[PDB]
Write a protein that binds this ligand. Structure first.
Ligand SMILES: [Mg+2]
Ligand SMILES: [Mg+2]
Ligand SMILES: [Mg+2]
Ligand SMILES: [Mg+2]
Ligand SMILES: [Zn+2]
Ligand SMILES: [Zn+2]
Lengths: 45, 38, 97, 131, 176, 54, 222, 162
RNA sequence: ACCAUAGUAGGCCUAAAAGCAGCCAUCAAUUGAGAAAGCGUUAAAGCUCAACAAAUUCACCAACAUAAUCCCAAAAACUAAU
């Protein structure tokens, strides 16, 4: 394995793909699952 | 100057230089350390 | 450091070294910065301001020296030797000051 | 020339290796700064102003630091360790006070470092402190 | 102008030697320095000689930073002996335990010397034990019940040694 | 104030008092050994440089 | 950063009482009443006695022959006593007190008339014989440093050697005389009477092997 | 090759480093197994003061010598080439490797006396007035003794003192 | 090149002995510094060495004037030399 590229803000345009895939996971779920997630996060965090 | 056959440094600021075909111990801080190889 | 200390650096106002530490030609400018940021230099005169600008995408190490003769010594040191930069800076500031 | 007469590892170098391994294993914030040749009194004052926040500063020779770093996962830190170096070790990082105490000195520059396996530059450190 | 290290008794402050010439060359008025020394050391009635740092400015003005008193006097007070041994290692100067050394470490942890360093009390106790090593005072791990017997025997041994030393000194003075 | 033995932690009793630690007694993997070796090297340099003519 | 190296510690060295050099007399307590001939064989040739270390570790090795009289003895004694540490070093003589009388004749006397009058005494020293042998818990650099002056002030050429230095030089000489390239050597020619060279040579050259010429010894001549 | 350029524009000094193209080593050396340049190119005991194309490769444009840590020669050959470069400079070869002085080239001096294989400096040797007799003769040294190991096709030794 | 902070004026005699007229111990802090290997003070102070951090060409000794009428063959570093 290796480390990251450690970019700067001069040309900051690349975001990690894990954030985008998490957003897609949230977007691909029905309202009941979103409510269940909200309940679990409120209980734990 | 002092003309000598064997030259040595009497202080850490002396420097040895070859000039005019001879060796010279030159000192700036203490000018009495000026030695010339005969 | 001794060469700068013996030269009487009271006649300088601002010295800034702008560089990117993550490049391959930064050893010389880092050595120059460490030489000018020594204690003998600092106690020679306290009216000077020394600044170390750190960038990431600048990629162009440089040094700017503004001193009270209204003079601006700019030095784009990307391949110069640290000793060469030190001696050039000393010989310019002592000649003009 | 004849083949290589390989050098033998000694207690001091093994101790340095295990020490650096402990450094990169235990603590979280590993900042890389340029060691400025400063006075003893001011250096000790900076040590006190760092220990008030419980952050330590350490120095390791490059001859033993470069090979370990290029073998480890922090090989991106190689350009930072060319000249004089200072490793700032902090458990439970709090970059705000570190930046506050660093701004008090103008010619002591923060080169970079890692905040829980996050290699960042000086601007990244400032952003993390402001966050 | 510079810095001067001066070891001065807590209850004593005189405008004389060795404090005389060292301040006279600097030009600082000795009467003032004695006044502030009395004002700052009148709160301690233990009467322990202490080292202090005098920072003389170029304008003939001076600053005082008071410090923890001397380790030698601390060990002498803890052990009960007026002067240290002449030949350290060949003779025993006194006897203390870890309790006195620990107390000295705690009272010295607040000095200007060990305040900047942030090592634990173990380094301070190591330093005090080394200072006692140079002093000649012997330290034991656990002799609380025997320390009274140790005191009653070492006092006799030390007085006998002092009498022998006085006789030898008198003989040397007569011969010289 | 005479404090009882239970108040004093272990780092008072574990430390040596009488004999200084020597070169062959210490662990070659311990920092104290290298400190003492540096001290002995300084002693060597002082002994060798006793003939300074400057 | 530099690598630490271990110190050779000297624990098996015991400094004896009176480590300083003993005073030597210009004339022995019993003076030689009979004048003797000045034999030069006590200088010519290599030394047979006092060629190895006894209890010390450093020595003054003589590369030539000569005479050591009271002036040289006092010079060496005073120099060693003043420049030697009495707590960590000790010194010893390897040459006896001056015992060979030397006869001198006053100015204005024509030749003949008999032997002169005994003026002073000397100790004959051959090449390869130790003069002062020292030991203790010290290194070789300092003893060499303050023994080179004594060696230089000595009449014959001399050096401040040690056990290791003496062994190194002897092995170097052996290696040189074993890997010598030219087939012709002084030993071979002298022993074989090549070219009838024994007419020019001396009977002692068969033992000297061309390395010793008079009182001078050249270690580079195989 | 690097160059330091200074620009003066209204009380402002700009010092910049410029990197130019540099010639590289030839592709096929006779002895690739040698680490050292001359004695991997098979020129050991072959060069002399006459050989200018080899002496001129590593010298400063002002006639100065180049550091061994940069060149790479073994120490004996570094010393030999230092002596050879001194000999050539004193003999009058390498005409373009002199500093350019517009002021001193107008006041001409005495014509440069032709010389070759000169060992010492021209301004440091005193003339020999006694010259010695047959048995004790003070010779004029010619050439450097470091060049005594060069190949001798004739077989006769090089007379270094005459 | 590179820098030098800490117990501490380590303990005795001496008007003073603060690394240094002298004697005994020669511990111990910071990753990194000897109760101090050389200068200096009446005593200090102060200037250098070795210790870390920065690099790492090689680095032990070896050089020494002279006479008298006028210096004394001239010359020559490579065409093949048992
Ligand atoms: Mg001689
Ligand atoms: Mg330590
Ligand atoms: Mg140093
Ligand atoms: Mg004369
Ligand atoms: Zn000098
Ligand atoms: Zn080579």
């Amino acid at each position: 394995e290796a480390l990251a590229g450690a970019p700067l803000d001069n040309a900051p345009k690349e975001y990690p793909p894990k954030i985008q895939q998490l957003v897609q996971d949230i977007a691909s779920l029905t309202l009941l699952e979103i409510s269940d997630l909200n309940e679990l996060l409120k209980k734990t965090l | 100057f002092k003309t000598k056959g064997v030259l040595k440094k009497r202080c850490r600021d002396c420097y040895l230089v070859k000039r005019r075909g001879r060796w010279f111990i030159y000192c700036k801080t203490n000018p009495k350390h000026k030695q010339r190889q005969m | 450091a001794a060469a700068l200390a013996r030269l009487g650096l009271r006649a300088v106002k601002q010295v800034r070294v702008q560089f990117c530490p993550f490049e391959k030609n930064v050893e010389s400018t880092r050595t120059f910065l460490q030489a000018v940021s020594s204690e003998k230099v600092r106690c020679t005169n306290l009216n000077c301001s020394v600044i170390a600008d750190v960038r990431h995408d600048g990629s162009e190490p440089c040094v700017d020296v503004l001193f009270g003769d209204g003079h601006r010594l700019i030095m784009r040191g990307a391949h110069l030797t640290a000793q060469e930069m030190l001696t050039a800076f000393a010989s310019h500031i002592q000649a003009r000051g | 020339p004849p083949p290589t007469p390989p050098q033998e590892e000694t207690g001091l170098v093994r101790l340095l290796r295990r020490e650096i391994a402990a450094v990169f294993r235990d603590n979280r914030m590993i900042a890389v700064c340029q060691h400025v040749a400063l006075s003893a009194e001011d250096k000790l004052l900076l040590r006190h102003q760092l220990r008030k926040h419980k952050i330590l500063m350490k120095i390791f020779p490059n001859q033993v630091l470069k090979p370990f770093l290029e073998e480890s996962k922090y090989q991106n830190l190689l350009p930072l360790f060319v000249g004089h170096n200072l490793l700032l070790v902090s458990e439970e990082p709090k970059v705000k006070e570190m930046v506050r105490i660093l701004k008090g000195i103008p010619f002591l520059p923060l080169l970079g470092g890692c905040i829980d396996d996050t290699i960042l530059s000086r601007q990244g450190f400032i952003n993390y402190s402001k966050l | 102008s510079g810095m001067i290290r001066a070891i001065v008794r807590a209850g004593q402050a005189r405008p004389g030697p060795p404090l005389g010439p060292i301040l006279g060359q600097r030009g600082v008025s000795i009467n003032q320095f004695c006044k502030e020394f009395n004002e700052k050391t009148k709160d301690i009635k233990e009467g322990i000689p202490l080292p202090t740092k005098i920072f003389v400015k170029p304008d003939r003005t001076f600053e005082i930073k008071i410090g923890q008193p001397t380790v030698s006097y601390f060990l002498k007070a803890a052990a009960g002996i007026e002067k240290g041994a002449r030949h350290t290692g060949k003779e025993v100067a006194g006897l203390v335990t870890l309790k006195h050394v620990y107390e000295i470490a705690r009272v010295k942890a607040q000095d200007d010397a060990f305040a900047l360093q942030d090592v634990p009390l173990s380094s301070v106790v190591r330093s005090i034990i080394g200072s006692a090593r140079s002093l000649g005072i012997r330290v034991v791990k656990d002799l609380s019940s025997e320390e009274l017997a140790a005191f009653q025997k070492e006092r006799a041994l030390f007085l006998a040694a002092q009498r022998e030393a006085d006789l030898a000194a008198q003989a040397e003075a007569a011969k010289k | 104030v005479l404090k009882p033995d239970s108040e004093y932690p272990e780092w008072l009793f574990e430390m040596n008092v009488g004999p200084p630690k020597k070169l062959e007694e210490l662990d070659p993997e311990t920092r104290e050994y290298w400190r003492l070796l540096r001290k002995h090297n300084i002693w060597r340099h002082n002994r060798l440089s006793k003939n300074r003519k400057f | 950063f530099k690598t630490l190296l271990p110190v050779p510690t000297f624990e098996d060295v015991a400094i004896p009482e009176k480590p300083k050099l003993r005073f030597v007399e210009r004339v022995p307590l019993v003076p030689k009443v009979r004048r003797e001939r000045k034999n030069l064989s006590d200088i010519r040739g290599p030394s047979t006695e006092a060629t190895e270390f006894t209890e010390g570790r450093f020595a003054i090795l003589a590369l030539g022959g000569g005479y050591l009289h009271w002036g040289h003895f006092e010079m060496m004694r005073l120099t060693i006593n003043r420049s030697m540490d009495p707590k960590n070093m000790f010194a010893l003589w390897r040459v006896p007190a001056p015992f060979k009388p030397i006869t001198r004749k006053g100015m204005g006397q024509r030749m003949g008339g008999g032997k002169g009058a005994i003026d002073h005494y000397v100790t004959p020293v051959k090449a390869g014989r130790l003069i002062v042998e020292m030991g203790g818990r010290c290194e070789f650099k300092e003893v060499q440093g303050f023994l080179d002056l004594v060696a230089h002030k000595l009449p014959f050429p001399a050096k401040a050697v040690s056990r290791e230095t003496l062994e190194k030089m002897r092995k170097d000489q052996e290696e040189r005389e074993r890997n010598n390239q030219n087939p012709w050597t002084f030993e071979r020619i002298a022993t074989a009477n090549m070219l009838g060279i024994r007419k020019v040579l001396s009977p002692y050259d068969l033992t000297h092997k061309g390395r010793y010429w008079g009182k001078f010894y050249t270690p580079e001549r195989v | 090759f690097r160059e330091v350029v200074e620009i003066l524009d209204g009380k402002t000094t700009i010092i910049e480093g410029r990197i130019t193209e540099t010639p590289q080593e030839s592709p096929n050396p006779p002895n690739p197994t040698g680490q050292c340049p001359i004695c991997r190119w098979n020129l050991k005991h072959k060069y002399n003061y006459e050989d200018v194309l080899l002496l001129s490769q590593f010298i400063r444009p002002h006639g100065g010598m180049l550091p061994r840590r940069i060149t790479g020669l073994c120490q004996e050959e570094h010393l030999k080439i230092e002596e050879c470069v001194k000999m050539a400079h004193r003999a009058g070869l390498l005409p373009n490797h002199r500093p350019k002085l517009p002021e001193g080239f107008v006041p001409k001096s005495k014509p440069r006396l032709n010389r070759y294989l000169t060992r010492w400096s021209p301004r440091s040797v005193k003339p020999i007035y006694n010259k010695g007799h047959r048995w004790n003769k003070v010779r004029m040294p010619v050439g450097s003794p470091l060049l005594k190991d060069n190949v001798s096709y004739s077989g006769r030794p090089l007379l270094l003192y005459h």
